[PDB]
RNA sequence: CCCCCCCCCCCCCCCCCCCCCCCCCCCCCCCCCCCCCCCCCCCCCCCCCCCCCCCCCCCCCCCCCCCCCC
């Protein structure tokens, strides 16, 4: 039987990768500073002082944001995440210490954290700039409010909202989605931007891009923090904003699967072409693989998961061309810079998709109309 | 019943080989230097110093790359791999030692590893050349960056990417795919080649070819390392590149199975010929055997697995000729130097495959079009 | 190799209920006859017959696999 000449390559590769009986485990490099629940308020305070500082130095904002995420996860969950990702980690306990020094010829007391990644002088400088900005703002408006202060319990999660946007755009492979991050951070979080003068989306976003490029285990820690944060029973409005922006990253790097489902839904005719029909068996294999993976597959491209390549549809040039053409005709492809490699199928699918919007007829069979007196109403 | 005159030779041979109750186990030769997680940073450092050295001596790059792979696997997993492959191994512990010698009439301290395969003088020379190249580059551009240094944590995995390309081309039986390796290593890893002056794809590829020819157990260790590396939850971009290039080796040496599936998919008419139909029963037996093997069968030809011959379709000259002709007509066979041994079936299949691309009609039955007003739109 | 776009979400109105209504109610013990069952005839079996018998070892050719692109 010719119908039995089949190779389930996608499923076979998944079975090969998921039944490995040997494991590697990597070295993160320097010791990882793992804060616990104890210093969560101090890290949030540090984030607030970074936010209330106009022209803030956001060189360490990504590092502090990851510290905040790790303190909300806790030491035990963070360490377990790092083992499960397959990393050798030398965990550093983070505790609060007091430092007295003479700036402006005066003895003043400073409360800092013992971090190998973030030096004490840097934390002192952050606090000093925050104090200068705070007193300037107090002079220029008289009295401060809970809105304008480092004590707000959402100061860390605003920074983590910027981080969530950067995560949504990480699948592009570089800092190319920075403009989209800045735009969406102006639309979302506009009241916050009016609130905090040091909330500079570009600087914070560049800091998070940099920290994710340096430490690829921070991407893992942040994704699992965002899954744990979105697994709560509730929260504040800023935490809801973060959860909404973090689910915006689901399926990032896999737009062609969604656009193929859309091309099927609008019943594009070019899906019936002979070459597309030749590829349908394997494209269906890919879709069954994706829906077998389930929810974990939505962050494969963010995380640089090795099995991300198994979700690709570009190995089906005709189907991919029809899908891209349907997206182009429906006016959703935008500035997507993936290119069709079958120009004729792309053009035909685009033409039909454009024809779809102009036309359109009601299908009365999908309802339960027993008696159709609608003909007389015409 | 004439339909009961059948021999399931492929399944019977597989059952014979998989139910063996006696096992051989071989001798690897010299002692195998098995590094553990401890010296992973040192091996990665050695790889980085090899990469930053223009006109580098890549005679030992394959050996060092295998050392890096074995250190990411660890001593226990590497030793277990070597037992499971059926080898007597005398494992050598690898540890770091300090060596002081007088070069340029100065006492300087050198940090090396105790390897029976790689002598101390060789490691010292690698470090000395790296230092010369580093100072020359520093002079010619002023200040170095994390991009240009041995401390980058991906220096070993770039070398292992070259190794992955060599693995993809190992099924050709010799160093014939070296040009393809060099081309794909220029396309992929182009930013890295701009980054590292000692990244010479030809030299590294020849080193890995040589190490795989000398030690066939390194092929086993590397394949299982690449399966364990692709079984992680995530990583950096270079690790993702490695995983993508290592899945490029899946099914290597078995192109005719994939091309037969493709010939079935495009509905080549010559599959209905009388002789092809005579062979269909056994070719279907081969396909069921492949899909019963599953994912493990994708590396049978790389590994020189004995059961690789059971996946061959060349014992079916007419089916193979139709498959090769379909590939030739579709313009994918390229410079494949397997030859059809039924010229007429090859020519007929090629002619029909060429006819396929020019023609092509939409099959509206595969959609769910309840009402087809498309006839009026023509 | 892969990837590449865009995108927070939400937003209205709204307590519920409201009546009437206990149920039941009569008549009526049941039974009632006739009838033991059985009953004859009949041992069973009965012949013939060992089985087997020829011819015949089997085998015999050819053939590693792979090879592209990504």
Numbering used by the authors:
A (entry chain A), B (entry chain B): 2 to 379
Give the authors' words:
HRSV belongs to the Mononegavirales order with the non-segmented negative-strand RNA genome fully coated by the viral nucleoprotein N. The resulting helical nucleocapsid (NC) shields the viral genetic material from recognition by the innate immune system while serving as template for replication and transcription by the viral RNA polymerase complex, thereby constituting a potential drug target. The helical HRSV nucleocapsid is a template for the viral RNA synthesis and a scaffold for the virion assembly. The helical NC, together with the RNA polymerase L, its phosphoprotein cofactor P and the transcription factor M2-1, form the HRSV RNA synthesis complex that constitues the minimal infectious unit of the virus. We explore the polymorphism of the nucleocapsid-like assemblies, report five structures of the full-length particles and two alternative arrangements formed by a C-terminally truncated nucleoprotein mutant, and demonstrate the functional importance of the identified longitudinal interfaces.
The 2.86 Å resolution map and the resulting atomic model of the N10 double ring show that the N protomer and the entire N10 ring are identical to the crystal structure, with 0.5-Å RMSD over 378 backbone residues and the density of the last twelve residues (380–391) largely disordered. Accordingly, the RNA binding groove formed by the interface between the N-terminal and the C-terminal domains of N (NTD and CTD), and the “4-bases-in, 3-bases-out” RNA conformation remain unaltered. The visible part of the CTD-arm of Ni lies on top of the CTD of Ni+1 implying that in a helical NC it should be situated in between consecutive turns. In parallel, the NTD-arm of Ni+1 inserts into a compact fold of the CTD of Ni from the ring interior and extends towards the CTD-arm of Ni-1. Examination of our HRSV double ring structure verifies the presence of the tripartite Y23-D221-R234 interaction and shows that it occurs inside the N-hole of Ni which carries D221; the loop 230–238 of Ni-1 provides R234 while Y23 is contributed by the loop 18–32 of Ni+1, whereas Y23 on the equivalent loop of Ni points into the N-hole of Ni-1 so that to bind R234 of Ni-2. Thus, an additional tripartite stabilisation of the “latch-bolt type” interaction seems to be a signature of the HRSV NCs. In the double ring, the NTD-NTD stacking of two N10 rings, whose centres of gravity are 67 Å apart, is assured by D1-symmetry-related β-sheets providing two opposing interacting H100 residues and two R101-E122 hydrogen bonds. Interestingly, examination of the crystal structures of HRSV and HMPV rings reveals their bottom-to-bottom (NTD-NTD) stacking but with a tighter packing, with an inter-ring distance of 61 Å and 60 Å respectively.
